[PDB]
Write a protein that binds this ligand. Structure first.
Ligand code: SF4
Ligand SMILES: [Zn+2]
Ligand SMILES: [Zn+2]
Lengths: 212, 732
C-alpha cells in the first residue's frame, strides 16, 4: 500500500500493514514473504529478470537508503576488500598519494565500469594480505576495545554521579530528621547545662556546620 | 572631558573604574543603574581614553544588541564630538563606524525593497562577484553595480572621510559620494578608530566575521547590557535542520548534477588548472565579497586546514560524499525520530561505520562544497543556502563535539504530529565562544545593568581582576518604588505552581491588580508576560469572562503579535497614543524580543508590573547537559542559575523605563518567589535603599495608596536633585 508491495503475488503488503519489505543487491523492490519461496525456486535470484545473488543480500530498509543502488554497492564494494585496502595507508603513507590515488579507484568502481578484475588481480599481490588482515584485525580489536570503554565510562560516571546525588539526598534528610530529634530529647530529661537556653543554643549552632 | 554640569555624582564613581581597568589592563565588570546614560557614563571616559595615547595604542571596538540604539549611541556623541571641540580649540580627525550589512545595503531599486536580508544580499553578491566575476565583460547581463567599480577607483585612491556616519548617511552619499556600506566600510576598517555594530555580528561562529586584523596588541573593546551571552553564543552555534530542507536539498542534489553533466570541460578545465594549484600551493581563490557568501570559519579555534583536498579527489566523487552523507544523514534522522538522543561524539563515531572516510572529509567539506561551486559560479545563493547549512554541520561535528552537545527534537513543538522533526547541535562552552574573543583582545569590559550576582562571570568560566558593586546616591527624592506584591486577600500564587493553564482562579485577580494599576498610574505602562501562548493564555479568560469592561475604558491596550510585523504596529501607536489624550497601556512579553532597543522615557513608559517568575519553562532537555556541565564545573548550580536566568532577564526587561535620573519608574513585583531570589537578582544599589524597606507582603489594595503616595509627592517640588559643581571630595 506504499510503493507496489512485491511484483509477485500481492498477498503480503495489502494484507499485513505492520511489516516492511526487503531490498536485494541491485536496488529492487521485494516483499518479505517472497524470501522463503526464493529458496526453493532459484536460490538467490532477483525477482524481475533472474539476476543471480549471494546469501539473499536482503537489506530490510524502506528508509530510501538502498533505493539509490550506488549507496548499497558502496556498502558492498568499499567494505569488500577496499576497506581492507584502505586503512593500511593512513597508518603509513608518504603524504597524500596513498589517499588520493586510492580515492580515485573508489570512483572507478561505482560507475559500473567493469574494469575491476584488472585491479582485482593486482589487488593484494604486490603486498602482504596478512599484513592487510592484521591491521584490519588491529583496528577492529582496537575500536571494539575503544568503543566499549567509552560506553562504560559514560555508564559508570553518571550512575556514580546520580548515586552521589542519591546519597546526599539521604545524607541531608535523616541528618535533619535526627539532629532535631536529638534536639528534641536534648531537653527531655535535662533542663540544659546551666541555663534555659544554653546548650540548646549550643546544639542550635553546631548542627548547621555539620551540613556545611 | 564632558562633566558639563551636575552629572548625578557618577562619572567620578566611574572615573577610577577606567583607570583601574585600563591603565592596569583590567578585564573588568561594571554594575550600572538603568537610569545612567550608558555611554554618557562610559564613552565620555572612553573617548577621553581615546586621545590619551597612554603608552601608544588605544583601539576602539564597541558593540550592543539593537541597531536603533546603535545609532542612539552615535546620536549624542556627535555633540560630545562637538563639545570639547570648541573647548580644546581645533578639531582632530575621528571615525566611528556603524557597520551594518544585513538590512542597510543597496541603493539599486531592483534589489532593495524585497523584505528579507540574506537572500537579497545573495542576489546582490550573485550579481557582483558571481555573475560579474564569471561573466566579467558584458553590457546587459553584467549589471550596473557601478559604485563597486567606484570603490575600485577610490580603493586605488586615498580619500579621508569625516566623522561617524550612519546607515542612511552613506546612502545619500551613495546617491552622491559615500560608497557601499560594505566597501565604504572595508576601506574605513583599514583606518577605523571606533567601530559600533551588533553584539551578534562579532559572535558569528558560522561565518567567522573577523572584524579587524587579529591584532591583540591593545585590542580595546567595550560591552553594554551583555546579559544573555549563552543565549547568544549557544544560539550562535545552534544548528537547526528541517526535513523539508533536506528534501529540497535532496531535490537540488541531482539538480546540481545536471549542471555537472552539461559542463564537460568549460568550467571543468577551469577547475583542472586550479585544483592542481590546490594541491601545489594552498590559497583561497577570492579575497572580495565572495567570502561574505561563504562560511569563513565554522570552527574558529583551530590551527589551519592544512591537508585540504580530503579523501575526495573529484567533484561527483565529492558530490557522492554528500550522497554518502545526506542519504545516510536521513538514515541518521528518520529512524531516530522515535527517541530523543543526546550523544554528541557517539554520533560521529557511529557515523564512521557508515561514512567511509571520516574526520578529514567531515572537516574539509564546506569549502570543497563551495569551491566546486566556485568553478561553477552559477547557483543562486538562496537555492544553495539549505546546502551550505549541511556542510557547515558535519564540519562542526568534525571538530568540536566532545565538549559540545547534540540534541534531537522530533516531537511536539508547533507540530501536533511528527510532521517536522528536527535535531540541533548546540555548543555549551560560551567560554569557548569568548575565549577566542579574549585571546584576540587585550582586557575588555562587560557592563550589565542587570548583573547582580558576580558569581555568574564564572558561568562564563573566566578570570576577572575588577568586579565590584556600583553604588550611587539618590538626592532625587527617591529613585523608584520597587513593590513586591504578595497579596494576602487574593492569596498570591504568582509563580506558575498551578501553571499558566492549570487554574484560572490564580488569574482572577491579575486583572484586579492591573486595572487598579491602570486606574492610578497614568502615562503609559509596558508590562512583561512570559511567552506568546502565555500571553495567549493571559487574555484567554479576559475576553469571555468580564475583564476589559473597565480596562479599555481607562486606558487602551496594545497587543504584541507572534509576528513581528503586527508587533511593530501597536508600537507606532504606543509612542503616539501616549503623547495624546490617552494613557494606552501596552501589553508585552519579557522573553519575547519586544523587550530590547527602546529605552522608555518619562514621556511615555514609566511603570512595569512583574507577572510570574521570568524563567524559561519551555525548551526540554536543553537544560540537562547545560545543567550537568556546570555541575561538572561548580556542582551546586541547579538551584543557583535557574534563579538568575529569570533574574538576568527580569531587570533586563523591567529595569528599562528610566533614562536620565528623574525619569520615574514604578517597577512593582507581582511575584511568589521573592524570598531570596528577587533579592539576589536585584542590584546591590537597588535592594539596599529601595527594595522592601518595610514593604514585602503588600496586598495590591493596600499597595494602591503606595504609588499614590509615591507619584503625588514625586511629581511636584523638583528643582535641585544632587547638584554637583566643583570638586569637594565627599569621598563617596
Ligand atoms: S554592492 Fe553595494 S550596490 Fe552592488 S549590490 Fe551590494 S549594495 Fe547593492
Ligand atoms: Zn543486479
Ligand atoms: Zn510477495
Amino acid at each position: 500500500m506504499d510503493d507496489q508491495g512485491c511484483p509477485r503475488c500481492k498477498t503480503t503488503k495489502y494484507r499485513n500493514p505492520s511489516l516492511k519489505l526487503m531490498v536485494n543487491v541491485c536496488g529492487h523492490t521485494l516483499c518479505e514473504s517472497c524470501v522463503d519461496l526464493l529458496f526453493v525456486r532459484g536460490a538467490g535470484n532477483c525477482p524481475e529478470c533472474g539476476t543471480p545473488l549471494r546469501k539473499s543480500n536482503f537489506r530490510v530498509q524502506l528508509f530510501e537508503d538502498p533505493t539509490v543502488d550506488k549507496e548499497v554497492e558502496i556498502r558492498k564494494k568499499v567494505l569488500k576488500i577496499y576497506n581492507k585496502r584502505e586503512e593500511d595507508f593512513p597508518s603509513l603513507r608518504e603524504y597524500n598519494d596513498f589517499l588520493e590515488e586510492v580515492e580515485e579507484i573508489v570512483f572507478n568502481l561505482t560507475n559500473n565500469v567493469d574494469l575491476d578484475n584488472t585491479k582485482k588481480k593486482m589487488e593484494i599481490y604486490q603486498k602482504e594480505n596478512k599484513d592487510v588482515i592484521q591491521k584490519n584485525k588491529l583496528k577492529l580489536t582496537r575500536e571494539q576495545e575503544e568503543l566499549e570503554e567509552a560506553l562504560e565510562v559514560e555508564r559508570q560516571e553518571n550512575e556514580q554521579r546520580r548515586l552521589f546525588i542519591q546519597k546526599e539526598e539521604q545524607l541531608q534528610q535523616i541528618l535533619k530528621r535526627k539532629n532535631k530529634q536529638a534536639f528534641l530529647d536534648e531537653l527531655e530529661s535535662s533542663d540544659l547545662p546551666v541555663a534555659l537556653l544554653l546548650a540548646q543554643h549550643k546544639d542550635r549552632s553546631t548542627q548547621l556546620e555539620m551540613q556545611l | 572631558y564632558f562633566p558639563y554640569d551636575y552629572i548625578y555624582p557618577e562619572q567620578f564613581s566611574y572615573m577610577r573604574e577606567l583607570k583601574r581597568t585600563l591603565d592596569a589592563k583590567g578585564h573588568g565588570v561594571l554594575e550600572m543603574p538603568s537610569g545612567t546614560g550608558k555611554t554618557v557614563s562610559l564613552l565620555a571616559l572612553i573617548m577621553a581614553y581615546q586621545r590619551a595615547y597612554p603608552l601608544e595604542v588605544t583601539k576602539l571596538i564597541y558593540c550592543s544588541r539593537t541597531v536603533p540604539e546603535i545609532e542612539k549611541v552615535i546620536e549624542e556623541l556627535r555633540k560630545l564630538l562637538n563639545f570639547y571641540e570648541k573647548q580644546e580649540g581645533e578639531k582632530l580627525p575621528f571615525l566611528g563606524l556603524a557597520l551594518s550589512s544585513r538590512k542597510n545595503l543597496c541603493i539599486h531599486p531592483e534589489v532593495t525593497p524585497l523584505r528579507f536580508g540574506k537572500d537579497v544580499d545573495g542576489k546582490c553578491h550573485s550579481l557582483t562577484a558571481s555573475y560579474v566575476r564569471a561573466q566579467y565583460q558584458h553590457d546587459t547581463s553584467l549589471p550596473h553595480c557601478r559604485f563597486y567599480e567606484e570603490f575600485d577607483a577610490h580603493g586605488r585612491e586615498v580619500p579621508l572621510p569625516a566623522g561617524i556616519y550612519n546607515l542612511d548617511d552613506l546612502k545619500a552619499l551613495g546617491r552622491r559620494q559615500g560608497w557601499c556600506p560594505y566597501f565604504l566600510a572595508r576601506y574605513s576598517i583599514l583606518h577605523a578608530n571606533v567601530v559600533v555594530y551588533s553584539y551578534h555580528y562579532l559572535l558569528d561562529p558560522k561565518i567567522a566575521d573577523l572584524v579587524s586584523k587579529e591584532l591583540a596588541r591593545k585590542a580595546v573593546v567595550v560591552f553594554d547590557e551583555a546579559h544573555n551571552i549563552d543565549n547568544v553564543c549557544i544560539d550562535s552555534m545552534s544548528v537547526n535542520l528541517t526535513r523539508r530542507t533536506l528534501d529540497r536539498c535532496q531535490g537540488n542534489l541531482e539538480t546540481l548534477q545536471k549542471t555537472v553533466l552539461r559542463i564537460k570541460e568549460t568550467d571543468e578545465q577551469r577547475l583542472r588548472d586550479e585544483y592542481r594549484r590546490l594541491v601545489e600551493g594552498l590559497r583561497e581563490a577570492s579575497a572580495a565579497r565572495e567570502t561574505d557568501a561563504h562560511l569563513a570559519n565554522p570552527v574558529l579555534p583551530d590551527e589551519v586546514l592544512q591537508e585540504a583536498v580530503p579523501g575526495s579527489i573529484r567533484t561527483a566523487e565529492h558530490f557522492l560524499g554528500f550522497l554518502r552523507r545526506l542519504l545516510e544523514y536521513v538514515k541518521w534522522r528518520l529512524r531516530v525520530q522515535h527517541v530523543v538522543q543526546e550523544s554528541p561524539p557517539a554520533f560521529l563515531s557511529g557515523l564512521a561505520q557508515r561514512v567511509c572516510i571520516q574526520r578529514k572529509p567531515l572537516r574539509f567539506c564546506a569549502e570543497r562544497l563551495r569551491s566546486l561551486l566556485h568553478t561553477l559560479e552559477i547557483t543562486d545563493l538562496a537555492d544553495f543556502s539549505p546546502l551550505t547549512l549541511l556542510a557547515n554541520f558535519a564540519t562542526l561535528v568534525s571538530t568540536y563535539a566532545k565538549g559540545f552537545t547534540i540534541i534531537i527534537e522530533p516531537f511536539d513543538d508547533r507540530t501536533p504530529t511528527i510532521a517536522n522533526p528536527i535535531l540541533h547541535f548546540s555548543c555549551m562552552d560560551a567560554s569557548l565562544a569568548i575565549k577566542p574573543v579574549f585571546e584576540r583582545f587585550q582586557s575588555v569590559i562587560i557592563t550589565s545593568g542587570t548583573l547582580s550576582p558576580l558569581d555568574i562571570y564564572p558561568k562564563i568560566l573566566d578570570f576577572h581582576p575588577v568586579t565590584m558593586a556600583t553604588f550611587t546616591m539618590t538626592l532625587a527624592r527617591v529613585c523608584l518604588c520597587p513593590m513586591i506584591i504578595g497579596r494576602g486577600n487574593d492569596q498570591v500564587a504568582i509563580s506558575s505552581k498551578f501553571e499558566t493553564r492549570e487554574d484560572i482562579a490564580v488569574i482572577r485577580n491579575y486583572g484586579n491588580l492591573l486595572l487598579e494599576m491602570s486606574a492610578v498610574v497614568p502615562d503609559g505602562i509596558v508590562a512583561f508576560f512570559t511567552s506568546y501562548q502565555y500571553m495567549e493564555s493571559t487574555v484567554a479568560s479576559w475576553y469571555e469572562q468580564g475583564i476589559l469592561e473597565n480596562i479599555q475604558r481607562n486606558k487602551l491596550l496594545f497587543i504584541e503579535t507572534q509576528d513581528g510585523a503586527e508587533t511593530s504596529v501597536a508600537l507606532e501607536k504606543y509612542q503616539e497614543a501616549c503623547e495624546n489624550g490617552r494613557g494606552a497601556i501596552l501589553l508585552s512579553v519579557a522573553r519575547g524580543k519586544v523587550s530590547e532597543g527602546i529605552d522608555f522615557v518619562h514621556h511615555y513608559g514609566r511603570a512595569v508590573i512583574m507577572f510570574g517568575v521570568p524563567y524559561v519553562y519551555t525548551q526540554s532537555r536543553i537544560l540537562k547537559a547545560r545543567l550537568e556541565y556546570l555541575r561538572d564545573q561548580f556542582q551546586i548550580r541547579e538551584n543557583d542559575f535557574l534563579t538568575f536566568d529569570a533574574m538576568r532577564h527580569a531587570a533586563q526587561c523591567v529595569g528599562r523605563a528610566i533614562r536620565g535620573k528623574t525619569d520615574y519608574g514604578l517597577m512593582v513585583f507581582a511575584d511568589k518567589r521573592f524570598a531570596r531570589g528577587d533579592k539576589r537578582g536585584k542590584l546591590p544599589r537597588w535592594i539596599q535603599e529601595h527594595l522592601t524597606d518595610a514593604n514585602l507582603n503588600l496586598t495590591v489594595d493596600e499597595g494602591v495608596q503606595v504609588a499614590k503616595y509615591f507619584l503625588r509627592q514625586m511629581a511636584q517640588p523638583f528643582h535641585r536633585e544632587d547638584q554637583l559643581g566643583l570638586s569637594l571630595l565627599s569621598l563617596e
